Design a protein around this ligand. Structure first.
Ligand SMILES: [Mg+2]
Ligand SMILES: [Zn+2]
Lengths: 79, 247, 249, 637, 80, 166, 50, 309, 215
């Protein structure tokens, strides 16, 4: 389970933007566009996003470039 | 039978429950002996003398002791009713006292402290220090949980203002008050309060469009506007006042 | 009875009708769990009609709190009694002494924290011996009929339900005395008309193959409230003067 | 549903009824069922959950595992009145609450009820575990002190754990470590509270971000050596040697949190609860009627104090005194008796232990139960012990006029018919007033949240040089509240100075935590200009660099947190508890602050101006004791 | 001060169409059926008459049977 | 300021005749004299925000923008004199006087006419607002709570800071 | 709402409801009796001389 | 050195109800270690038998009163809960009670069966107050272990078709209490070994030797294990089963559709994009598939079979 | 009448000498009795070995000043007890301490006996001070049987068990409601791992029943 989320706020500031980042990422998972960057413990899509917040491999700065790169991938779909 | 907290008494300043227990240990103790003395089915005379002693106790009043009627066939039934316990009357300000309780505890066999040794059933060792034990009178009120506990997911709503119903009692759900909204305002919780007063209850469309989501597995909301605000608009519009929505 | 009382318990239990008093005294004639019959002595008894003391104890009746009020005879048999004494014991009354509940063995110790604040730890022996158990009685009533389209009949047929529902309802349509009743069961079948729906060729087919009551009519039934259960004990019926009932009444 | 105890629960979880949880999460259970193919369509899904088929309870176990819920009490005061826990399926109709957070709700287990809520939308699921969780609020928004502090039954445990009798088994022996200490206690050989010396390892992180080891032979007891295994890592061993009152158990948690972070203070506090209930049980603690001892000298005190009222009454009969001074004399001579008996029973229930070791005798604090209950800060206070042993006090009439015939008896001795009737007034007026302060408290916090509300942290730094000058209150004999409590958790408006200047110890705006504060304790500085929310430069709300830090977390306050609501709540929550010749006690150097004077004949001091503050400066240099001196005094210094 | 409470009749059948995917185009066809459902539970319209109501040439009269059966299969079974 | 007689001191005199940094110390130190003597721990900052809200309305002593005696928000005037120093008039800036209002008197100052229908008498607010042709833009919390949209305080601040431009 | 010294022997000083109404109910006494006019009676024993 | 062993010693009988046992040779401190386990397991696991289903002559429910008895039907039921009985070869037996005339009904009035041990012949069931009244009942006895309340047995259901069957509570507890003590045992030998003396209380339906045997037996079994250390989606049938037209059934097999499992989660537009189908065939598959449950949509996970593998 | 046999699915050991093991399902009331019984059989009697006594070189006593190891003779008398020493079929041995210098005296610096095995070469008996610091002595480790303190005749701690705890938790078997999850947490001194120590310790309990139960 997620007992103390302190490791999250300890990285991303404002503690509320943490909710927006983990929420948007958890949306990227629950409605699948992506896969977890960290192994699943059987925890829900809510917790996996926070696990990604702790490891520092998912935050507001990364998801922007992810989304944009996938946009340019869809413009690259000419085939 | 019942394990209760010691720290409740020195705080609540009710010491009567400390005496009602102690005397109880005495009042039960005599019974526990009487039963045993009847468990050995002795002659009518021995139980007669012991019951004489039981109603004598400390000097004075006002006993008016036994042996008045026949003490064989007439008092034999007074035993069977005493083999459970020994009913005792403690008038309000005329009731028992310290040396009275101890003096009655001496009768069967009990210590003055009203405390014995106990052993944990999960271990078998001994509890350090004594433990106050006895027979206390317990009362079961009617608050019973089965009548209280309630759960509501989706019930029938109200007509005039589409809202959940009349209480914990069926079919409704707990009233989330303005003070609870203040507690949510303190915390940075925003979508929590939003869903609270929009999608959970108030909104007419948002509840159903949300329900078609929860089952699908996509947790989201299309909040819209609370319906009872749309009611307040018409209620103000019933006066000579006009209230619109601009921009 | 309370191990530690004030002595006023007798002055309580007797002062209220919860107990069973005695108009007179003398040896009891017939003691049962229902009625008690006393043979009155001569000095108390009036010259005319002679007579005996007949007592009918209320057995398992409702109360304003949804509790159960019941009388327990305390007299063995063939025993002399004195006027102004208790023949039986109602609820929470033990042989003339008022018993609001039970007592038991208590010990004040911390147990690892299940006794925190006013929380109470109770041995399994207590719930096993069935002492603190209570008996709840609830009153579920049904009356309607009298519609501008004609009266509503109580059961005796209830289309739209299969065999199981009609199994635990008597031939009259009232529920049998006693049952396992829970959830959505049918205590009393209750119907109601709508009327002179134009038959058309279709409804003749409908009325032919099933035909039921003939079931042209809706289902008005009183049913057990969901999430509630019990066992049916007593059933009363009040039939408005001028209208019979088939059997149960 | 009704609330019961959670002693087996972790701080982040709580109990929930099974049949209730099946209904609460029902829309989730539908979809999860049809997602696995257990049910074809919705109609069959609800048809299954109505039958309560055994397959659906596991589905529930899936959707309820990491999905948080929301509890709450009927009254809500502080923001902590609603705390989210993790659901644990429990068979029953009753809800189970964690005992540590129980002090937050102000929830007695005497039959209160709790409300549950389900954070449906995903963002709500995140806000419930993020800012609404238990571990994330361990500190009341009213004060940065721990709100998780153990209450009564548990602190009775740690108190019974840390104690020493003058003599017991295992006396004057040495053990290798804590494992041999508990290994000695669980064998029935070593005594729980006994004088011992054991070797342990107390870590300290006092290096730069690095834990350093240490070892020594510390004087301690078996119980304290067992209690040390609970203390995480770098905390010093000096914290666990003491009687361990309900206070000293707080600063332990606060230090743990402000040193090791959030998690070690969480698992640590929980462990404290478990061990405290454990040995609180094994202690065999109880209370008897004889555990409360009445002073043997009480009757003589009653006869003396009642013998003085005969003198004053006879003087009223002889015309010497009058009704005004006799009514005031009898009450004083009667109250001094209550004071005397209070000190008599407080002596006889405290140090009366007479116990022998080796040679003749020694005296210590008593092992009497109720005394320990009051001493540990568990439940009950010395006032209540006073009423339960000696004369309980004096009572008044409906108007409040104190009767000249106080209550001589107590609760241990049978009260008479008069004393109960006279006490009925005080009891009833107490109930009525304390019942009125509820509506008064809510009426207060409602106005306060009405006026503040929209005040919210808006700009991070407004760049203002204006701020209040913080000084200790230094009331009368000694300071009521020190500088540390009115400073910590805030940010300076300007650089202060050491005894030598040109050196900047605090560089302009800096948060003052346990580092900078104790640093100011190294120096003598008694005053700083702090940034205050009233001095904030920015418009429409406050600034984080102004409002300071204090929150449920020890870190600086974040941006976009509404401060006014939680402040007004913090003020409105503790609304129920609401109802000669000058000298200096300690030596110092008398210093007159801002006074004009003159010398009289032949010489002495006499004060001319109005404002005169006599400040005490001891050999340390702290400005200490302040007595306001009137105009035209005579100073011998 | 309340004389009112909610009730569900055909509204119950509409609970079906929201949760059960018909996509968008077929859901409107199913919504057109529930209006025709009598209190007795049978359609007043002819299967070609609801076809007139939709006013579309993409119904084919086959698709309406496809959706009409699916709403028949939700409890109450047999309905409509 | 000085002792011209004994007894308490009205906060108005401490605010005007002494200053803000005085009256705040008087208020928070007095109420802390109450709560602290009872064993209640309340950090001074909370009382400091409650005191800060009592200082909103301010009466001007000068002119050059608006009328002389207008009681108005210290922020409303502060933005005008801070904007009136540079550019504008060379310096016309009108010195204000920060006034002192009670709790219920200060809470009476609300731009929101919808939030004005809640904690004050609704009849009066609806009458005056309706006849004045007022327009409530939402913004502050209570109105947005009633209207069923995100609260511009907590996490929802991320919505209202980005939406202000849109 | 409060208790009066006249309640002695007539109105029960202890047993009263706790809530919005305190002292507005109270109770009777064990030996209490209804007075002839409107008042309450208390039983007392006549002591003449000693 | 590893020489210590317990063995049983004299069994002291006192009364029929309770008795005492003793164990002479226990090692250092081991009398307490094994003793508390004996009390615990002896109390908890104690195989026995008691009353389960009580039928009465004219009694519909347990809240009425049968004319001719002073005890309420409920009180008679609770009086049956304390009946001691011991069977041998049967796991359950149906007793029979018949009697008339005034006077109490003793536990001896039952009809003697193959295994009937009544250790309380004078036990009180209920009194008869009338010369002509007879309670003709059937008392049922079953064998079990532990405490099994009558309310928790309603999940098994199968109903109870009899309207007069009164389910009572299952005691299954021959032991009302067990108390032990360990005193210093003098058997010489040597300095000290220790002994156990158990006063164990029994209703009388169980011998002390068999009881204190089986308890240690269960302890030994748990020690044995100690020393060394359904999912079915409803319908998967061939897509060919739904019997699709003639030509339209081949189009699905062209894309290799395995049963309905993958056919359910296929979207309406996904089938449209398949080559050589047309909208009409799509209306057909929607019709036939929608005739039975569901329609194109939802979603699931895995499959027991593989692709022709 | 059928009984529940436990299935242990997990052994999770901490480092090496520490082990945390879980057990379930158990009958109601069966967790605390197994955990308690096994706890007492592990704590109070575990076959083993430990230090019965040691000779002294500089002095003859247990109280005096060294001088090469700043700790007193009692302070070093502790580290001796914490020395894990296992022996082969040899029933008794007396080891000697041969070392001197400015560097400390570990458990590796001792003499190497044939049938003796020390599990901790890193163990610290004492730390040696300047110059010669002549230190030599003889240490006898007798057979561990239960626990025999010093007042019974150097404290010898025989049982390898340094800790015994059974923390019971809630367990669920499908429709079963309340079950005991019996979790044992034990760490040893290094002579034997907790697993097998738990094995034999349980086996003693099994042998105490050998005269009563019929299979
Ligand atoms: Mg309470
Ligand atoms: Zn600022």
């Amino acid at each position: 389970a997620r007992v103390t989320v302190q490791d999250a706020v300890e990285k991303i500031g404002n503690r509320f933007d943490l909710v927006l980042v983990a929420a948007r990422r958890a949306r990227q998972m629950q409605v699948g566009g992506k896969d977890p960057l960290v192994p699943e413990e059987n925890d829900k899509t809510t917790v996996i996003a926070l696990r990604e917040i702790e490891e520092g491999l998912i935050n507001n700065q990364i998801l922007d470039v992810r989304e944009r790169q996938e946009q340019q991938e869809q413009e690259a779909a000419e085939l | 039978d019942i394990v209760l907290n010691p720290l409740g008494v020195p705080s609540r300043m009710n010491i009567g429950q400390i005496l009602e227990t102690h005397l109880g240990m005495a009042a039960k103790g005599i019974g526990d002996k009487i039963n045993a003395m009847l468990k050995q089915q002795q002659e009518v005379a021995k139980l007669r003398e012991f019951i004489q002693r039981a109603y004598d106790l400390g000097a004075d009043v006002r006993q008016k002791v036994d042996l008045s009627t026949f003490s064989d066939e007439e008092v034999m039934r007074l035993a069977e009713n005493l083999r459970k316990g020994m009913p005792i009357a403690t008038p309000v300000f005329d009731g028992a006292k310290e040396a009275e309780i101890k003096e009655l505890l001496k009768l069967g066999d009990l210590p003055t402290s009203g405390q014995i040794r106990l052993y944990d059933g999960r271990t078998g060792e001994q509890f350090e220090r004594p433990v106050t034990v006895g027979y206390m009178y317990m009362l079961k009120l009617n608050h019973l949980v089965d009548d209280k506990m309630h759960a509501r997911s989706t019930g029938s709503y109200s007509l005039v203002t589409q809202q959940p119903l009349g209480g914990k009692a069926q079919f409704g759900g707990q009233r989330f008050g303005e003070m609870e909204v203040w507690a949510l305002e303190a915390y940075g919780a925003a979508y929590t309060l939003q869903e609270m007063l929009t999608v959970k209850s108030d909104d007419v469309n948002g509840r159903t469009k949300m329900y078609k989501n929860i089952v699908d597995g996509n947790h989201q909301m299309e909040p819209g506007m609370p319906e009872s605000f749309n009611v307040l608009l018409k209620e103000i519009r019933s006066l000579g006042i006009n209230i619109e929505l601009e921009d | 009875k309370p191990l530690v009382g004030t002595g006023m318990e007798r002055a309580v239990a007797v002062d209220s009708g919860v107990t069973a008093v005695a108009k007179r005294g003398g040896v009891v004639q017939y003691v049962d769990a229902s009625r008690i019959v006393i043979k009155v002595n001569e000095d108390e008894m009036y010259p005319g009609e002679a007579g005996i003391d007949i007592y009918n104890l209320t057995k398992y009746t409702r109360s304003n709190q949804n509790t159960c009020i019941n009388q327990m005879p305390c007299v063995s048999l063939g025993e002399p009694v004195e006027r102004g004494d208790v023949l039986a014991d109602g609820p929470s009354t033990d042989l003339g002494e008022l018993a609001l509940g039970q007592n038991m063995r208590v010990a004040f110790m911390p147990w690892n924290g299940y006794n925190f604040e006013d929380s109470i730890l109770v041995s399994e022996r207590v719930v096993q011996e069935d002492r603190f158990t209570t008996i709840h009685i609830q009153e579920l009533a049904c009356v309607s009929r009298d519609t501008k389209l004609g009266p509503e009949e109580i059961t005796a047929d209830i289309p739209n339900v299969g065999e199981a529902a009609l199994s635990k309802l008597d031939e009259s349509g009232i529920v049998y005395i006693g049952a396992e009743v829970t959830g959505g069961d049918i205590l009393v079948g209750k119907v109601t008309p709508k009327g002179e729906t134009q038959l058309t060729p279709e409804e003749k087919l409908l009325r032919a193959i099933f035909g039921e009551k003939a079931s042209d009519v809706k289902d008005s039934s009183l049913r057990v409230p969901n999430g509630v259960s019990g066992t049916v004990i007593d059933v009363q019926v009040f039939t408005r003067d001028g209208v019979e009932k088939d059997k149960r009444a | 549903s009704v609330i019961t105890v959670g002693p087996y629960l972790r701080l982040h979880q709580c109990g929930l009824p099974k049949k209730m949880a099946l209904e609460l999460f029902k829309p989730f259970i539908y979809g999860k069922l049809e997602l696995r193919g257990l049910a074809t369509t919705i109609k069959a899904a609800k048809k299954m959950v109505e039958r309560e088929e055994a397959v659906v309870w596991d589905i529930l176990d899936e959707v309820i595992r990491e999905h948080p819920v929301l509890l709450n009490r009927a009254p809500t005061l502080h923001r902590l009145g609603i705390q989210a826990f993790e659901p644990v399926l429990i068979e029953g109709k009753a809800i189970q609450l964690h005992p540590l957070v129980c002090a937050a709700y102000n929830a007695d287990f005497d039959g209160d009820q709790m409300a549950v809520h389900v954070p449906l939308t995903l963002e709500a699921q995140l806000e419930a575990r993020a800012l609404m969780m238990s571990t994330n609020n361990i500190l009341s928004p009213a004060n940065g002190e721990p709100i998780i502090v153990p209450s009564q039954d548990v602190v009775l445990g740690l108190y019974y754990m840390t104690r020493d009798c003058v003599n017991a088994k295992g006396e004057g022996m040495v053990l290798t470590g804590p494992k041999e200490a508990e290994r000695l206690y669980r064998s029935g050989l070593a005594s729980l509270h006994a004088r011992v010396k054991v070797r342990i390892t107390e870590y300290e992180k006092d290096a730069n971000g690095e834990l350093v080891a240490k070892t020594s032979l510390k004087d301690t007891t078996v119980g304290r050596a067992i209690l040390w295994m609970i203390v995480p890592k770098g905390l010093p061993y000096s914290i666990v040697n003491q009687a361990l009152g309900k206070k000293a158990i707080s600063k332990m948690l606060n230090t743990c949190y402000r040193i090791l972070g959030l998690k070690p203070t969480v698992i640590f506090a929980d462990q404290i609860m478990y061990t405290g209930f454990a040995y609180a049980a094994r202690s065999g603690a109880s209370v008897g009627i004889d555990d409360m001892v009445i002073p043997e000298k009480k009757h003589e005190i009653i006869s003396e104090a009642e013998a003085e009222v005969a003198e004053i009454q006879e003087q009223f009969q002889s015309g010497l005194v009058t009704a005004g001074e006799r009514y005031n004399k009898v009450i004083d001579i009667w109250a001094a008796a209550n004071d005397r008996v209070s000190k008599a029973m407080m002596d006889n229930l405290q140090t009366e232990t007479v116990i022998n070791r080796d040679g003749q005798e020694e005296k210590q604090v008593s092992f009497n139960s109720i005394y320990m209950m009051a001493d540990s800060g568990a439940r009950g206070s010395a006032a209540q012990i006073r009423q339960l042993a000696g004369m309980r006090g004096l009572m008044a009439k409906p108007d409040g006029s104190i009767i000249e015939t106080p209550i001589t008896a107590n609760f241990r001795e049978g009260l008479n018919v008069l004393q109960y009737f006279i006490s009925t007034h005080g009891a009833r007026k107490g109930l009525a007033d304390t019942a009125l302060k509820t509506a008064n408290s809510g009426y207060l916090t409602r106005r306060l949240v009405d006026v503040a509300q929209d005040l919210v942290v808006t700009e991070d730094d407004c760049g203002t040089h204006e701020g209040i000058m913080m000084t200790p209150v230094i009331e009368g004999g000694d300071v009521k509240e020190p500088l540390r409590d009115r400073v910590l958790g805030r940010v300076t408006a300007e650089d202060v100075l050491k005894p030598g200047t040109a050196d900047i110890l605090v560089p302009r705006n800096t948060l003052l935590h346990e580092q900078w504060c104790d640093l100011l304790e190294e120096n003598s500085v008694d005053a700083v200009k702090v940034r205050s929310v009233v001095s904030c430069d920015t418009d429409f709300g406050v600034c984080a660099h102004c409002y300071g830090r204090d929150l449920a977390r020890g870190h600086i306050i974040n941006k976009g947190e509404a401060i006014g609501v939680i402040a007004a709540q913090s003020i409105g929550e503790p609304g129920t508890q609401l109802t000669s010749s000058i000298q200096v006690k300690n030596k110092g150097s008398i210093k007159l602050s801002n006074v004009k004077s003159v010398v009289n004949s032949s010489g002495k001091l006499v004060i001319t101006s109005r404002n005169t503050e006599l400040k005490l400066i001891d050999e340390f240099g702290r400005t200490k004791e302040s007595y306001k001196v009137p105009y035209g005094a005579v100073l011998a210094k | 001060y309340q004389g009112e409470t909610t009730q569900t009749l055909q509204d119950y059948l509409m609970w079906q169409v929201e949760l059960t995917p018909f996509t968008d185009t077929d859901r409107a066809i199913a919504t057109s059926i529930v209006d025709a459902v009598d209190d007795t539970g049978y359609l007043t319209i002819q299967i070609e008459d609801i076809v007139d109501s939709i006013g579309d040439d993409e119904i084919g009269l086959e698709e309406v049977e496809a959706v009409l059966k699916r709403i028949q299969r939700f409890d109450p079974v047999g309905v409509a | 300021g000085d002792v011209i007689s004994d007894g308490p001191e009205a906060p108005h005199d401490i605010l005007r005749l002494r200053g803000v940094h005085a009256v705040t110390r008087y208020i928070v130190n007095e109420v802390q004299d109450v709560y602290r003597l009872q064993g209640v721990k309340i950090n001074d900052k909370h009382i400091e925000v409650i005191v800060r809200q009592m200082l909103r309305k301010a009466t001007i002593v000068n002119a050059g923008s608006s009328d002389f005696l207008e009681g108005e928000q210290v922020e409303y005037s502060r933005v005008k004199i801070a904007n009136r120093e540079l550019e504008a008039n060379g310096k016309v800036g009108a010195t204000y006087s920060r006034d002192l209002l009670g709790i219920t008197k200060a809470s009476l100052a609300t731009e929101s006419f919808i939030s004005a229908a809640s904690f004050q008498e609704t009849t009066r607010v609806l009458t005056e607002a309706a006849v004045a042709g007022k327009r409530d833009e939402l913004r502050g919390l209570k109105e947005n709570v009633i209207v069923g949209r995100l609260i511009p305080a907590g996490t929802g601040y991320a919505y209202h800071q980005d939406r202000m431009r849109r | 709402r409060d208790v009066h010294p006249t309640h002695y022997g007539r109105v029960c000083p202890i047993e009263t409801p706790e809530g919005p109404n305190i002292g507005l109910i109270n109770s009777l006494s064990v030996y209490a009796q209804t007075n002839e006019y409107g008042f309450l009676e208390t039983p007392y024993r006549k002591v003449t001389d000693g | 050195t590893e020489f210590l062993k317990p063995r049983l010693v004299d069994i002291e009988q006192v009364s029929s109800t309770h008795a005492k046992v003793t164990l002479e040779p226990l090692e250092r401190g081991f009398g307490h270690t094994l003793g508390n386990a004996l009390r615990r397991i002896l109390l908890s696991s104690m195989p026995g038998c008691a009353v389960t289903e009580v039928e009465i002559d004219g009694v519909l429910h347990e809240y009425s009163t049968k004319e001719g008895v002073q005890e309420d039907i409920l009180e008679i039921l609770l009086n049956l809960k304390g009946l001691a009985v011991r069977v041998q070869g049967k796991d359950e037996v149906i007793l029979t009670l018949n009697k008339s005339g005034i006077g109490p009904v003793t536990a001896a009035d039952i009809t003697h069966d193959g295994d009937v041990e009544i250790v309380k012949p004078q036990h009180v069931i209920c009194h008869l107050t009338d010369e002509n009244a007879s309670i003709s009942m059937r008392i049922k006895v079953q064998r079990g272990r532990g405490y099994v309340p009558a309310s928790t047995r309603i999940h098994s259901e199968e109903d109870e078709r009899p309207i007069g069957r009164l389910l009572v509570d299952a005691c299954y507890s021959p032991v009302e209490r067990i108390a032990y003590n360990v005193e210093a045992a003098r058997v010489e030998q040597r300095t000290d070994l220790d002994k156990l003396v158990i006063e164990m209380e029994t209703n009388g339906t169980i011998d002390p030797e068999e009881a204190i045997r089986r308890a240690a037996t269960i302890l030994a079994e748990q020690l044995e294990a100690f020393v060394d250390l359904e999912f079915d989606p409803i319908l998967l049938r061939p897509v060919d089963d739904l019997e699709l037209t003639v030509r339209s059934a081949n189009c699905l097999k062209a894309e290799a559709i395995h049963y309905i499992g993958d056919l359910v989660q296929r979207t309406e537009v996904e089938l449209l994009k398949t080559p050589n189908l047309g909208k009409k065939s799509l209306t057909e598959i929607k019709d036939v598939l929608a005739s039975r449950g569901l329609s194109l949509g939802m979603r699931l996970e895995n499959w027991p079979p593989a692709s022709i593998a």
